[PDB]
Design a protein around this ligand. Sequence first.
Ligand SMILES: [Ca+2]
Ligand SMILES: [Ca+2]
Ligand SMILES: [Ca+2]
Ligand SMILES: [Ca+2]
Ligand SMILES: [Ca+2]
Ligand SMILES: [Ca+2]
Ligand SMILES: [Ca+2]
Ligand SMILES: [Ca+2]
Ligand SMILES: [Ca+2]
Ligand SMILES: [Ca+2]
Ligand SMILES: [Ca+2]
Ligand SMILES: [Ca+2]
Ligand SMILES: [Ca+2]
Ligand SMILES: [Ca+2]
Ligand SMILES: [Ca+2]
Ligand SMILES: [Ca+2]
Length: 505
Amino acid sequence: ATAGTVTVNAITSDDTIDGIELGQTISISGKAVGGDISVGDVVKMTINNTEYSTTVKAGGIWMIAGVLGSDLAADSEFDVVVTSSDAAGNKVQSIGTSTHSVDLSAEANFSLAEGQQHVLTNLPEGFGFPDGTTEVVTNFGGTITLGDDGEYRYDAPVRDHGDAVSDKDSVTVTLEDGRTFTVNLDIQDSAPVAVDDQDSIVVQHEEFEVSEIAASWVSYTHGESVTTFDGTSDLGGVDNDSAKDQIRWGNPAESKQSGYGFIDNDSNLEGRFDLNQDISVGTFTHYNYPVYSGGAITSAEMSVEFSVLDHLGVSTPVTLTVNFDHNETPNTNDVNASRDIVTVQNTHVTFERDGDIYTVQIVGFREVGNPDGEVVTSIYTNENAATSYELVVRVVEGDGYSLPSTEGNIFDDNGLGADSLGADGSVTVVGVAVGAIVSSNESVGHSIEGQYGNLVLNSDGSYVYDVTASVSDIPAGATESFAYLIQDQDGSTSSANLSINVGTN
Ligand SMILES: [Ca+2]
Ligand SMILES: [Ca+2]
Ligand SMILES: [Ca+2]
Ligand SMILES: [Ca+2]
Ligand SMILES: [Ca+2]
Ligand SMILES: [Ca+2]
Ligand SMILES: [Ca+2]
Ligand SMILES: [Ca+2]
Ligand SMILES: [Ca+2]
Ligand SMILES: [Ca+2]
Ligand SMILES: [Ca+2]
Ligand SMILES: [Ca+2]
Ligand SMILES: [Ca+2]
Ligand SMILES: [Ca+2]
Ligand SMILES: [Ca+2]
Ligand SMILES: [Ca+2]
């Protein structure tokens, strides 16, 4: 008896029993050909301790109609034996061997937002918990719960998506029949949602009726040959009063004396001041000549006197004292170093009118004819030259301790709802900027300059905005817009705009 070749085809198409085939009946097949193998010969095989048999068909084909999937899952290797004979009664056995893989697992993949409950849909066919189990705890301590309604719900924990620890949760369910189901839960990050904010602030307009101004140099410290006088054509130019608007000093080292002159702004003011408005009370001229060392003042005081009229015709006199520190510097071959320096002090005076109080405050020096120019408190003048600047004051209601302001918190509901913080929390303001664009920057908790005023917005969302612009520079419908950026625990960010209506009345 000559043995043949016994072959076993793949056990299912992929040669592996999976979790669905586990519960099904599976046809096995193969061939038995060659040698003394003849049609009708017996084919036998033991699978998981059960014997299955059939016969060899024409062409050497053999098949087993139905083997239990559970048997093939329990026994991954088996022999097939074909019993044959030669013509002369002699027996022989042809043997083939089959191996297959067993993988009863199945995975379900989800990508779900943190801090929310989610119904798990499209689970793999046959998914379920072991009898009695209604909850499985995930690797992260979350849960998949089977509810009354037969739905499976996953409670996605909040995660720090910025750290070095993966945020892909997972759990494996094991059933008694050997199946496993691995649920992979990619936890997605949440973010805050900043919401635009609205605030408003009104600046008070009011016009005062004022007398002519009389400016007098009333005192000085140090200096030689110091004199004070009403201005003349040759020395300072003329004004409409007899107050002493010119001061001169020094022993001239080349030609004339150094000093100051102040020509009031009576004609331009036309007897009116406005409130909350940069106003020029006059033109200050610094005449810098070379004088011998030790002959110059170090400070001088000028009284700016004027009366304010109320609606009943009562005049209130007002004296703004203006202190100037003077530095007549040693002269070298360096022109810039040789410049003489005048510094005006930020003084003020408060007067009463019709039961309200108002404060006149020195703002400082402004280049002549440049009423939108930068205001400075120190001016520099070359030797052998004179510089001229408007002396700018502002009048405000009250004691002048603070400018018109409005405050708030961008986390509050300021007209369109409160910022949403997201599941991560730990939200703070990390950036603020004037305009429409902002990123995490170094302006939070700082004073930043807007179009009409300054903003201090802090990390906790609180802000103070104060108007610095003159009334005359605040157009109808004026508006500030500050973009701010908030950030949660693991870096998610959201921007919104704080819009401030800046009005006049
Ligand atoms: Ca298969
Ligand atoms: Ca099944
Ligand atoms: Ca035979
Ligand atoms: Ca076996
Ligand atoms: Ca195989
Ligand atoms: Ca294989
Ligand atoms: Ca993480
Ligand atoms: Ca997160
Ligand atoms: Ca005058
Ligand atoms: Ca005069
Ligand atoms: Ca005068
Ligand atoms: Ca000088
Ligand atoms: Ca000098
Ligand atoms: Ca307000
Ligand atoms: Ca907001
Ligand atoms: Ca986040």
